[PDB]
Backbone as CSV, one residue per row, in Angstrom:
resi,resn,N_x,N_y,N_z,CA_x,CA_y,CA_z,C_x,C_y,C_z
1,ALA,-20.882,9.893,11.703,-20.334,10.626,12.873,-19.436,10.873,12.957
2,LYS,-18.390,11.733,13.318,-16.658,11.210,13.638,-17.216,11.256,14.876
3,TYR,-16.208,10.336,15.552,-14.954,10.125,16.847,-13.680,10.618,16.753
4,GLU,-14.161,11.007,17.859,-12.494,10.894,18.071,-12.033,10.182,20.275
5,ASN,-10.746,9.189,20.027,-10.086,8.682,21.041,-10.984,7.825,21.014
6,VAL,-11.855,6.844,20.097,-12.592,5.568,20.866,-12.208,5.012,19.530
7,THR,-12.137,3.791,20.318,-11.448,2.076,19.862,-13.177,1.221,19.667
8,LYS,-14.019,2.093,19.401,-15.278,0.816,19.040,-15.232,0.914,17.406
9,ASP,-13.819,1.433,17.199,-14.486,1.049,15.463,-13.091,0.347,15.129
10,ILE,-12.047,0.474,16.096,-11.339,-0.811,15.642,-11.554,-2.369,16.071
11,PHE,-12.478,-2.280,16.918,-12.686,-3.309,17.598,-13.630,-4.087,17.049
12,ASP,-14.434,-3.442,16.113,-15.427,-3.683,14.928,-14.695,-3.893,14.010
13,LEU,-13.698,-3.399,13.690,-12.961,-4.211,12.519,-12.404,-5.333,12.944
14,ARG,-11.992,-5.452,14.003,-11.347,-6.876,14.463,-12.057,-7.904,14.818
15,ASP,-13.440,-7.147,15.043,-14.408,-8.616,14.748,-14.591,-9.249,13.531
16,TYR,-13.985,-8.063,12.920,-14.736,-8.302,11.232,-14.138,-8.908,10.600
17,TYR,-12.715,-8.654,10.442,-11.748,-9.801,9.762,-11.453,-11.034,10.507
18,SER,-11.869,-10.940,12.618,-11.098,-12.617,12.775,-12.339,-13.496,12.882
19,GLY,-13.393,-12.677,11.658,-14.707,-13.262,11.704,-15.000,-14.550,10.755
20,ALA,-15.502,-15.111,10.425,-16.002,-16.408,9.638,-16.287,-16.292,8.318
21,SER,-15.786,-16.669,7.360,-15.802,-16.725,5.293,-15.814,-17.683,5.449
22,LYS,-15.702,-17.510,4.289,-16.128,-19.564,3.397,-15.604,-19.203,2.003
23,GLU,-15.208,-20.099,1.403,-14.832,-20.404,0.135,-16.301,-21.039,-0.904
24,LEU,-17.000,-20.398,-2.052,-17.610,-21.100,-2.862,-16.715,-21.426,-4.485
25,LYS,-16.401,-22.472,-4.438,-16.018,-23.337,-5.511,-16.520,-23.826,-6.784
26,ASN,-16.220,-23.706,-8.031,-16.500,-23.941,-8.963,-17.934,-23.718,-9.211
27,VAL,-18.684,-22.505,-8.802,-19.852,-23.042,-8.677,-20.063,-21.325,-10.306
28,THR,-21.776,-21.259,-10.701,-21.573,-20.533,-11.404,-22.927,-19.687,-10.982
29,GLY,-22.648,-18.195,-10.824,-23.129,-17.116,-10.752,-24.250,-16.787,-11.812
30,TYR,-25.102,-16.391,-11.080,-26.410,-15.359,-12.027,-26.987,-14.063,-11.532
31,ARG,-26.134,-13.609,-13.107,-26.438,-12.161,-12.600,-27.254,-11.030,-13.033
32,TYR,-27.641,-9.849,-12.150,-28.971,-9.418,-12.016,-28.491,-7.442,-11.960
33,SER,-29.211,-6.897,-12.708,-29.290,-5.720,-12.379,-30.109,-5.338,-11.149
34,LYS,-30.077,-4.473,-10.453,-30.848,-3.447,-9.948,-31.123,-2.371,-8.490
35,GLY,-31.620,-1.102,-9.764,-31.082,0.320,-8.907,-30.017,0.427,-8.976
36,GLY,-29.721,0.472,-9.921,-27.727,0.974,-10.504,-26.613,0.021,-9.902
37,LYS,-26.810,-1.546,-9.145,-26.199,-1.958,-8.220,-26.357,-3.208,-9.202
38,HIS,-25.025,-4.239,-9.133,-24.986,-5.414,-9.538,-24.544,-6.326,-8.741
39,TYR,-25.414,-7.573,-8.971,-25.313,-8.760,-8.117,-25.200,-10.343,-9.114
40,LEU,-25.102,-11.203,-8.185,-24.737,-12.342,-8.675,-25.271,-13.602,-8.452
41,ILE,-26.220,-14.382,-8.004,-26.614,-14.852,-7.041,-25.871,-16.602,-7.420
42,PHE,-25.491,-17.098,-6.001,-25.362,-18.366,-6.361,-26.081,-19.045,-5.097
43,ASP,-26.227,-20.918,-5.777,-26.668,-21.860,-4.870,-25.059,-23.071,-4.937
44,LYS,-25.988,-23.399,-3.792,-24.188,-24.508,-3.290,-24.877,-25.311,-2.005
45,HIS,-25.342,-26.259,-2.076,-25.193,-27.354,-0.714,-27.190,-26.666,-0.461
46,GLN,-27.679,-26.210,-1.280,-28.912,-25.930,-0.720,-29.131,-24.563,0.173
47,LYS,-28.192,-24.036,-0.212,-27.719,-22.635,0.254,-27.211,-21.614,-0.649
48,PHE,-28.222,-20.339,-0.315,-28.130,-19.416,-1.407,-27.237,-17.943,-0.756
49,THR,-26.541,-17.363,-1.977,-25.460,-16.432,-1.553,-25.290,-15.241,-2.417
50,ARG,-25.837,-13.830,-2.651,-26.235,-12.858,-3.308,-24.458,-12.143,-2.851
51,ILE,-23.908,-11.713,-3.750,-22.697,-11.373,-4.154,-23.062,-9.658,-5.340
52,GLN,-22.342,-8.954,-4.604,-22.817,-7.845,-5.143,-21.151,-7.096,-5.835
53,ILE,-20.853,-7.136,-7.447,-20.234,-6.697,-7.956,-19.873,-5.138,-8.237
54,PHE,-18.443,-5.051,-8.504,-17.907,-3.851,-8.935,-16.570,-3.616,-9.742
55,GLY,-16.777,-2.551,-10.145,-15.094,-2.287,-11.408,-15.626,-3.062,-11.952
56,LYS,-14.355,-4.124,-12.651,-14.147,-4.664,-14.398,-15.245,-6.060,-14.137
57,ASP,-15.774,-5.997,-12.631,-16.729,-7.347,-12.696,-18.234,-7.009,-13.412
58,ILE,-17.903,-6.125,-13.355,-19.827,-5.064,-13.553,-19.638,-5.721,-15.701
59,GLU,-18.925,-5.118,-16.006,-18.482,-5.378,-17.757,-18.123,-7.038,-17.443
60,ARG,-17.049,-7.385,-16.604,-16.741,-9.327,-17.076,-17.520,-10.401,-17.406
61,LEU,-18.448,-9.908,-15.753,-19.733,-10.887,-16.106,-20.435,-10.542,-16.566
62,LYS,-20.750,-9.642,-17.939,-22.236,-8.407,-18.730,-22.951,-10.371,-18.445
63,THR,-22.042,-11.165,-19.784,-23.690,-12.108,-19.620,-24.694,-12.183,-18.248
64,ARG,-25.887,-13.222,-18.724,-26.494,-13.265,-17.437,-26.394,-14.708,-17.075
65,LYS,-25.698,-15.824,-17.654,-25.017,-16.739,-17.115,-23.239,-16.454,-17.492
66,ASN,-22.707,-17.350,-15.453,-21.412,-17.576,-15.819,-20.735,-18.519,-14.169
67,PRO,-20.624,-19.627,-15.538,-20.197,-20.579,-14.735,-18.505,-20.461,-14.791
68,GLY,-18.089,-22.107,-13.680,-16.516,-21.676,-13.505,-15.988,-20.667,-12.117
69,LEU,-16.947,-20.488,-11.398,-16.166,-18.969,-10.642,-15.870,-19.874,-9.202
70,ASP,-14.757,-18.832,-8.378,-14.478,-19.544,-7.238,-15.087,-18.262,-6.495
71,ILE,-15.451,-18.510,-5.122,-16.192,-16.766,-5.124,-15.933,-16.649,-3.257
72,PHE,-15.476,-15.450,-2.790,-14.711,-15.964,-1.000,-16.251,-14.685,-0.395
73,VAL,-16.555,-15.819,-0.137,-17.591,-15.043,0.663,-17.400,-14.887,2.799
74,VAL,-17.648,-13.279,2.731,-17.738,-12.951,4.382,-19.315,-12.033,4.127
75,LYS,-19.384,-12.623,4.768,-21.061,-12.173,5.012,-21.632,-10.048,5.849
76,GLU,-22.109,-9.861,5.113,-22.066,-8.625,4.981,-23.151,-8.343,6.266
77,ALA,-24.408,-9.102,5.891,-25.616,-8.934,6.207,-26.462,-10.398,5.824
78,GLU,-27.408,-10.545,5.953,-28.560,-12.047,5.714,-30.031,-11.687,5.993
79,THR,-30.133,-16.362,2.274,-29.319,-15.500,1.878,-28.752,-14.646,2.330
80,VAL,-27.349,-14.974,1.840,-26.208,-14.083,2.782,-25.747,-13.423,1.526
81,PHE,-25.259,-12.057,2.471,-24.999,-11.026,1.089,-23.337,-10.788,1.195
82,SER,-21.981,-10.692,0.490,-21.540,-10.493,0.441,-20.760,-9.701,-0.943
83,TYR,-19.441,-9.231,-0.901,-18.955,-7.555,-1.641,-18.361,-9.099,-2.862
84,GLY,-18.247,-8.909,-4.145,-17.073,-9.447,-4.603,-16.930,-10.474,-4.519
85,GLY,-15.106,-10.726,-4.886,-14.079,-11.797,-3.937,-14.552,-12.845,-4.947
86,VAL,-14.925,-12.597,-6.266,-15.647,-13.656,-7.292,-14.041,-13.322,-8.523
87,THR,-13.490,-14.557,-8.746,-12.557,-15.261,-9.175,-13.318,-16.346,-10.751
88,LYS,-12.264,-16.292,-11.393,-12.884,-17.690,-12.209,-11.778,-18.584,-11.610
89,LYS,-12.054,-19.811,-11.584,-11.465,-21.100,-11.560,-10.006,-21.382,-12.200
90,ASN,-9.783,-22.267,-10.758,-7.943,-22.170,-12.023,-8.311,-23.655,-13.070
91,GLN,-7.985,-23.171,-14.769,-8.129,-24.026,-15.285,-6.595,-24.570,-16.198
92,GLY,-5.274,-24.340,-14.646,-4.560,-25.614,-14.459,-4.975,-26.682,-13.609
93,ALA,-3.277,-27.371,-13.986,-3.122,-28.042,-12.796,-1.949,-28.245,-12.134
94,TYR,-2.560,-27.990,-10.741,-1.267,-27.213,-9.587,-1.035,-28.544,-8.263
95,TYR,-0.585,-29.263,-8.658,-0.444,-30.469,-7.208,-0.303,-30.171,-5.672
96,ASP,0.610,-28.849,-5.793,0.300,-27.588,-4.592,0.195,-25.979,-4.666
97,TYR,0.700,-25.918,-4.180,0.847,-24.005,-4.120,1.553,-23.610,-5.587
98,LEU,1.182,-22.872,-6.020,1.355,-22.059,-7.289,1.868,-21.162,-7.321
99,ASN,2.489,-20.703,-6.345,3.636,-19.097,-5.376,3.191,-18.995,-3.948
100,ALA,4.118,-18.672,-3.646,5.656,-18.557,-2.167,5.563,-17.391,-1.949
101,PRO,4.994,-16.249,-2.081,5.216,-15.278,-1.874,5.747,-15.074,-0.603
102,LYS,6.993,-14.109,0.104,6.983,-14.183,1.420,6.445,-12.723,2.410
103,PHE,5.373,-12.971,3.394,4.351,-11.912,4.003,6.160,-11.146,4.663
104,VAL,5.877,-10.381,4.962,7.499,-9.763,5.614,6.982,-8.465,7.154
105,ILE,6.359,-9.167,7.620,6.229,-7.787,9.471,7.120,-6.812,10.052
106,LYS,6.767,-6.036,9.972,8.115,-5.421,10.907,7.276,-3.957,11.177
107,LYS,8.065,-3.931,12.558,7.300,-3.141,13.865,8.544,-3.048,14.545
108,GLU,9.166,-1.291,14.604,9.225,-1.071,15.686,8.899,-1.179,16.579
109,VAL,9.885,-1.519,17.262,9.954,-2.085,19.130,11.150,-1.371,20.260
110,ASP,11.280,-0.576,20.719,12.029,0.344,21.429,13.100,1.014,21.015
111,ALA,13.814,0.240,20.677,15.407,0.371,20.325,15.657,-0.095,18.691
112,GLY,14.827,-1.528,18.671,15.013,-2.277,17.281,13.999,-1.935,16.416
113,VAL,14.344,-3.143,15.346,12.622,-3.813,14.740,12.834,-5.155,14.729
114,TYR,11.254,-5.839,14.629,10.586,-6.792,15.114,10.890,-7.419,14.006
115,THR,10.985,-8.326,13.328,10.769,-8.769,11.668,10.536,-10.581,12.036
116,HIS,8.886,-10.439,10.701,8.351,-11.858,10.671,8.319,-12.429,9.202
117,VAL,9.138,-13.571,9.198,8.541,-13.735,7.969,7.862,-15.213,7.770
118,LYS,7.242,-15.199,7.004,6.236,-16.654,6.399,5.816,-16.474,4.682
119,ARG,4.999,-17.944,4.727,5.244,-18.169,2.809,3.620,-18.069,2.866
120,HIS,3.193,-17.092,2.058,1.728,-16.519,1.750,1.748,-17.784,0.933
121,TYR,0.817,-19.082,1.254,0.928,-19.707,-0.067,-0.345,-19.473,-0.761
122,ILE,0.054,-19.598,-2.325,-1.073,-19.245,-3.466,-1.685,-20.303,-3.929
123,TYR,-2.992,-20.470,-4.540,-3.100,-21.415,-4.887,-4.249,-21.361,-5.801
124,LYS,-4.368,-20.274,-6.472,-5.467,-20.359,-7.208,-4.545,-19.114,-8.101
125,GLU,-5.069,-19.333,-9.906,-4.648,-18.581,-10.667,-5.217,-16.988,-10.513
126,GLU,-6.353,-17.183,-9.951,-6.434,-15.925,-10.400,-6.914,-15.139,-8.435
127,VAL,-6.863,-13.785,-7.716,-7.230,-14.487,-6.565,-7.496,-13.136,-6.334
128,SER,-8.686,-12.570,-5.224,-9.257,-11.256,-5.534,-8.731,-10.391,-3.852
129,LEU,-7.911,-9.001,-4.242,-7.516,-8.522,-3.338,-8.964,-8.900,-1.757
130,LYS,-9.916,-8.479,-2.142,-10.461,-9.267,-0.823,-10.359,-10.351,-0.512
131,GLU,-9.498,-11.136,-0.631,-8.902,-12.156,-0.526,-7.736,-12.635,0.526
132,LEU,-7.580,-11.402,0.032,-5.772,-11.422,-0.056,-5.732,-10.960,1.805
133,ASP,-7.220,-9.314,1.114,-6.889,-8.194,2.468,-6.932,-8.862,3.307
134,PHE,-8.473,-10.312,3.927,-8.832,-10.669,4.661,-8.050,-11.452,5.263
135,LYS,-7.644,-12.426,4.429,-6.391,-13.397,4.556,-6.121,-12.806,6.040
136,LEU,-4.380,-11.957,5.529,-4.066,-11.518,5.667,-4.136,-10.475,7.339
137,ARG,-5.006,-9.993,7.086,-5.060,-9.560,7.728,-5.968,-10.052,9.001
138,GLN,-6.290,-10.719,9.216,-6.590,-12.072,9.724,-5.787,-12.721,10.105
139,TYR,-4.217,-13.037,10.083,-3.197,-13.442,10.408,-2.337,-12.044,11.485
140,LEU,-3.054,-11.143,11.096,-2.279,-9.381,11.794,-2.710,-9.030,13.616
141,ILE,-3.880,-10.157,13.263,-5.439,-10.057,14.420,-4.563,-11.060,15.255
142,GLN,-4.648,-11.942,14.613,-4.509,-13.466,15.155,-3.169,-13.447,15.926
143,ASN,-1.578,-13.287,15.086,-0.286,-13.344,15.221,0.882,-11.670,15.964
144,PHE,-0.034,-10.870,15.628,0.703,-9.302,16.116,-0.343,-8.070,16.488
145,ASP,-1.442,-8.744,17.300,-2.285,-7.349,18.096,-2.595,-6.670,17.152
146,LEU,-3.018,-6.319,16.011,-3.265,-5.551,15.216,-5.204,-5.251,15.903
147,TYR,-5.311,-4.428,16.399,-6.496,-3.841,16.150,-7.056,-4.087,18.474
148,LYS,-5.427,-4.041,18.686,-5.509,-4.297,19.531,-5.572,-3.282,20.309
149,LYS,-4.781,-2.042,19.554,-4.292,-0.650,19.839,-4.921,-0.237,18.238
150,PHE,-4.779,1.439,18.270,-5.101,1.900,16.894,-3.306,1.719,15.990
151,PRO,-3.878,1.039,14.771,-3.553,0.565,13.614,-2.626,1.907,12.878
152,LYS,-3.312,3.377,13.629,-2.597,4.648,13.040,-2.299,4.122,11.805
153,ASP,-1.340,4.177,11.068,-0.358,4.609,9.703,-0.195,3.329,9.134
154,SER,-0.428,2.006,9.654,0.345,0.519,9.085,-0.086,-0.118,7.547
155,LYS,-0.167,-0.708,7.149,-0.336,-0.450,6.388,-0.035,-2.324,5.775
156,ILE,-0.878,-2.796,4.850,-0.418,-4.258,3.824,-0.447,-3.683,2.532
157,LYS,1.020,-3.150,1.842,1.783,-3.449,0.711,2.068,-5.214,0.172
158,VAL,1.013,-5.316,-1.456,1.410,-6.208,-2.026,2.352,-5.358,-3.173
159,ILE,2.773,-6.278,-3.270,4.066,-5.876,-4.260,4.205,-7.067,-5.205
160,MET,3.642,-6.585,-7.046,4.162,-7.690,-8.202,5.020,-7.537,-8.685
161,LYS,5.272,-8.891,-9.949,6.245,-8.980,-10.938,6.292,-8.123,-11.049
162,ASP,5.654,-6.992,-11.802,6.208,-6.138,-12.507,6.281,-4.753,-12.239
163,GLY,6.462,-4.553,-10.500,6.841,-3.717,-10.294,5.946,-2.626,-9.223
164,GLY,4.720,-3.449,-9.912,3.308,-2.620,-9.633,2.592,-3.031,-7.914
165,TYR,1.841,-2.130,-6.827,2.117,-2.917,-6.016,0.463,-1.834,-5.021
166,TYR,-0.463,-2.556,-4.483,-1.649,-2.662,-4.140,-1.270,-2.383,-2.472
167,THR,-1.965,-1.403,-2.041,-1.557,-1.040,-0.623,-3.296,-1.208,0.190
168,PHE,-3.069,-1.561,1.676,-4.361,-1.740,2.057,-4.445,-1.086,4.053
169,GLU,-4.727,-0.033,3.726,-4.372,0.840,5.153,-5.338,0.195,5.561
170,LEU,-4.197,-0.457,7.241,-5.546,-0.656,7.921,-6.110,-0.641,9.131
171,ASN,-5.906,1.203,9.117,-7.192,2.210,9.809,-7.971,2.123,9.596
172,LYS,-8.508,1.244,8.410,-9.878,1.087,7.797,-10.113,0.038,6.739
173,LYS,-11.612,-0.536,6.400,-11.527,-1.700,6.469,-11.493,-1.593,4.725
174,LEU,-11.755,-2.541,3.947,-11.179,-2.516,2.749,-12.365,-1.844,2.377
175,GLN,-12.282,-1.294,1.349,-13.195,-0.112,0.351,-14.303,-1.386,-0.512
176,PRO,-15.322,-1.526,-0.529,-16.506,-2.066,-0.604,-15.999,-2.059,-2.215
177,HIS,-16.024,-0.670,-2.617,-16.027,-0.796,-4.648,-14.686,-1.705,-5.038
178,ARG,-13.521,-1.850,-3.815,-12.633,-2.688,-4.416,-12.458,-4.299,-4.492
179,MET,-13.128,-4.771,-3.309,-12.774,-5.878,-3.066,-13.766,-6.628,-4.689
180,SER,-14.034,-6.091,-5.712,-13.798,-6.734,-7.297,-12.642,-6.636,-7.726
181,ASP,-11.860,-6.253,-7.502,-10.272,-5.828,-7.789,-10.187,-7.446,-8.178
182,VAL,-9.390,-7.902,-9.075,-8.389,-8.762,-9.561,-6.775,-9.462,-9.954
183,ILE,-6.383,-10.234,-9.415,-5.129,-10.401,-9.825,-4.133,-11.485,-9.664
184,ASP,-3.667,-11.947,-10.198,-3.356,-13.292,-10.910,-2.116,-13.273,-9.701
185,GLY,-2.924,-14.679,-9.367,-1.912,-14.671,-7.695,-0.460,-15.933,-8.247
186,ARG,-0.091,-16.222,-9.616,1.097,-16.189,-9.831,1.981,-14.658,-9.657
187,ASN,1.239,-13.074,-10.428,2.525,-12.234,-9.916,2.794,-11.683,-8.839
188,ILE,2.124,-12.154,-7.780,2.441,-11.664,-6.293,4.334,-11.157,-6.164
189,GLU,4.201,-10.838,-6.094,6.080,-10.627,-5.586,6.687,-11.179,-4.873
190,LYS,5.793,-9.912,-3.249,6.267,-10.219,-1.557,5.334,-9.462,-1.570
191,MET,5.224,-9.368,-0.622,4.064,-8.574,0.356,4.858,-8.158,2.007
192,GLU,4.282,-6.886,1.802,4.977,-6.579,3.423,3.690,-5.868,4.154
193,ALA,4.182,-5.965,6.044,3.325,-4.969,6.305,4.182,-4.141,7.754
194,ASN,3.169,-3.472,7.210,4.862,-2.076,8.480,3.229,-1.952,10.008
195,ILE,3.309,-2.238,11.108,2.131,-2.557,11.822,2.551,-1.731,13.429
196,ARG,2.470,-1.113,14.594,1.984,-0.599,15.371,2.570,-1.723,16.322
C-alpha cells in the first residue's frame, strides 16, 4: 500500500542498514534453481546460509560447484537467507588496503555547506555493490543522522576510474536485483554522498 507523512519505512530502513551483517570468506557455494529463482547454499562453522543470486551471477556461477567465494551476508529471513553479495576471493597478495577512495559527504547547513571526508578502505579485488551500499549507509546512520529525518533526494554516488558511476538512492532499500552487481575494488575512484 501507499503511505504519506509516515516514518515507518525510513525507520525500517534504519533498522535494516544498522543491523548485523557478516562475511563468509573463501567458501564454496553449491548452485541450484527452483521456481525461476537461483540460489547458492553454503556451509561454514556448521552453519548454513542460502543466497539468492541475480544479474550476471546467474550465468557466472552457472556450474553446480563454485569454490573460492567471499559472501557479504545480510539476513532477510531465516538457515539464514540473504540476497546476492557474492564475489570471487582475492587471488593477489596485499599487505593491507588495495584502494583507499575518498568518501565525501556534503550537507547544506543554513547559509553554508558541511563537508566530511574519510577514506573507505577497500581490501577486496571484487566488491559487491551490496556491501558498499550497506557499509556506506551504515556509516551515514551512525555519524550523520541518516533516517532520523526524511532522506528525500539524498544519494550515494560511486565514481569509477573510467568515469562511469553507480547511484544508491537513499529514500529506498537497494533493489534486490542489484545486489549481485559486482565491481573491481581497485577501480573505485571516489564516492560522494549528498544528504539532508
